[PDB]
Amino acid sequence: SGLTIYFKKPDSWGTPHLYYYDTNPKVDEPTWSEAPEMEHYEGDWYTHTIEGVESVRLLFKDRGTNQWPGPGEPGFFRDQDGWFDGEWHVDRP
Numbered sequence: 001s002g003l004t005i006y007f008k009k010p011d012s013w014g015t016p017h018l019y020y021y022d023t024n025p026k027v028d029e030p031t032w033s034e035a036p037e038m039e040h041y042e043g044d045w046y047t048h049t050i051e052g053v054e055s056v057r058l059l060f061k062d063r064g065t066n067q068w069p070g071p072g073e074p075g076f077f078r079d080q081d082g083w084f085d086g087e088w089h090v091d092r093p
């Protein structure tokens, strides 16, 4: 299985990282500061695949203090791929 997630980077952000927890099925889960670099995709879009996973809660961050959603707010729940530009889409919008 595995979730591919694409994320449109806000202009003022550094390169996005994907933080995730509540993996199902359970898979290794990085620390906030060790959340992985999303690979550059096309233009503003970046991407990362969580291996081994049907569902996840996730937050986007950079190496700075930016994150979406806010500090402490629950991760976005996916399900399925994958495109977030401020709202979620099954296809590139």
Ligand SMILES: OC[C@H]1O[C@H](O[C@H]2[C@H](O)[C@@H](O)[C@@H](O)O[C@@H]2CO)[C@H](O)[C@@H](O)[C@@H]1O
Binding pocket: 021, 031, 032, 059, 067, 070, 071, 072, 073, 074, 075
């Ligand atoms: O790990 C569960 C926890 O993850 C998310 O928390 C982040 C938080 O949003 C960051 O600002 C920073 O404090 O690191 C935390 C993870 O260690 C969710 O926001 C939170 O709801 C969830 O419980």
